[PDB]
Design a protein around this nucleic acid. Structure first.
Ligand code: ZN
Ligand code: ZN
Lengths: 223, 211
DNA sequence: GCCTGCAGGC
DNA sequence: GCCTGCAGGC
């Protein structure tokens, strides 16, 4: 949310690097530092190629939290980031098991997202969100991430106070409703209310992914 | 009154249609994200000619961050259409209507009206410090004081800190301050509320004097 | 805050 | 191919 560094996958190719000053491709790994824009009120991301970021003088010792959106990346890319950052047997086993179950939940989500990208269009996913009484976000990546959460963990029910929609941040689920026309609803819980997912009549690939889902799972959050 | 960042302070005057002073100052505040932004919008006529401009200015209150844009409109009427379009896009509610309905993440309008100089300069600078965006209307100041009473009552209740947040946002939007780059502080402390209350009392006395 | 390359809609 | 709104960039 209010962090300093932020990593993600390119939502478009118009982003110009700040080190090499050359365009960046789409669907590619990219990091950035948030800095106050001298042109208006609010932070802005200065983006950098993954290769160009480390030869500038930024010392990040633990990207596990210092970087926004680190938990929503592919596990191999998370590992690559951790490695580049530098350039109790019962407690250990419990921790390694959680790290392995977290890796399992990660690549499972991404594999479901990939199958969706390969066998669905943009307007296709638009209708899917509307079916389960969910809001339509602004962004292709956003729409994809929400459809994956609704399939696995279930369709989110409205807020109990604002009656608004909830979304997943790095830490937990946040509410995006408007308690008033001035401020926004500030709700945060790692366990929201939600009914089960409903694939419509035209959901031939329901078994193409949902059936494969081992199912009976719940979100595993970072420490 | 014309804005100086446009460079036409002496060259032009604000156009008007009786009670439609084409000059608005809007503000929006959100403390959970630490934003306190202003928006000046003006439609300027020439001092005496058939030349009309549109001026937009934005940024954080009492802070350098924020740029401006002065664009030349073709005629003396379509400029009004652009004015109204941007007004609605930034506030939600219409340019002229009794319904001052607030909108989520949308601005809200603000009603506006010898070694002696070596010190008068400092006095005017501190005046701007107290009023980072200029003079206010007694209507809005009294509304701010009533919201202050609401906040005092809600803190006496010691409950619904979300309502405290909402009321603090409404107030700071109604009364700007030069927080610099600092996040606007919450109004949960009795000392802070009484201090801002006596500040508003001093300002209201100064304004009733100015008559 | 404003600018704009771009994709869906026709 | 045109067009117009906008999610993305800054
Ligand atoms: Zn680069
Ligand atoms: Zn809510």
């Amino acid at each position: 949310s209010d962090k300093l560094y932020r990593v993600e996958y390119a939502k478009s190719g118009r982003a110009s690097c700040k080190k090499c000053s050359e365009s960046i491709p789409k669907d590619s790994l990219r990091m950035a530092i948030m800095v106050q824009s001298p042109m208006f009120d609010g932070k802005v991301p200065h983006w950098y190629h993954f290769s160009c970021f480390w030869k500038v003088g930024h010392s990040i010792r633990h990207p596990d939290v210092e970087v926004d959106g680190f938990s929503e990346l592919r596990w191999d890319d998370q590992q690559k980031v951790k490695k580049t950052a530098e350039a109790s047997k019962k407690e250990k086993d419990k921790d390694s098991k959680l790290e392995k179950a977290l890796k399992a939940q990660n690549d499972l989500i991404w594999n479901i997202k990939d199958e969706l990208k390969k066998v669905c269009s943009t307007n296709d996913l638009k209708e899917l969100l509307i079916f389960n009484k969910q809001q339509v976000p602004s962004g292709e990546s956003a729409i994809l991430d929400r459809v994956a959460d609704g399939m696995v963990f279930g369709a989110l029910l409205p807020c109990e106070e604002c009656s608004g929609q909830l979304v997943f941040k790095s830490d937990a689920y946040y509410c995006t409703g408007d308690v008033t026309a001035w401020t926004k609803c500030m709700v945060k819980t790692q366990t929201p209310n939600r009914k089960e997912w409903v694939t419509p009549k035209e959901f031939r690939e329901i078994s193409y992914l949902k059936k494969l889902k081992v199912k009976k799972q719940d979100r595993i959050f970072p420490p | 009154a014309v804005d100086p960042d446009s460079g036409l302070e002496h060259s032009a005057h604000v156009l008007e249609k009786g009670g439609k002073v084409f000059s608005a100052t809007l503000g929006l505040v959100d403390i959970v994200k630490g934003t306190n932004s202003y928006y000046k919008l003006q439609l300027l006529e020439d001092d005496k000619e058939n030349r009309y401009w549109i001026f937009r200015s934005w940024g954080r209150v009492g802070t350098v961050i924020g740029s401006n844009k002065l664009e030349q409109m073709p005629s003396k009427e379509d400029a009004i259409e652009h004015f109204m379009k941007l007004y609605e896009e930034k506030t939600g509610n219409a340019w002229h209507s009794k319904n001052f309905t607030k909108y989520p993440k949308k601005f809200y309008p603000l009603e506006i009206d010898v070694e002696s100089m070596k010190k008068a300069m400092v006095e005017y600078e501190i005046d701007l410090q107290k009023m980072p965006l200029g003079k206010l209307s007694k209507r809005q100041i009294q509304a701010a004081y009533s919201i202050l009473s609401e906040v005092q009552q809600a803190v006496s209740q010691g409950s619904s800190d979300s309502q405290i947040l909402d009321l603090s946002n409404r107030f700071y939007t109604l009364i700007p301050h030069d927080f610099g780059m600092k996040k606007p502080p919450l109004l949960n402390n009795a000392d802070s509320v009484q201090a801002k209350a006596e500040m508003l009392d001093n300002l209201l006395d100064i304004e009733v004097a100015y008559s």
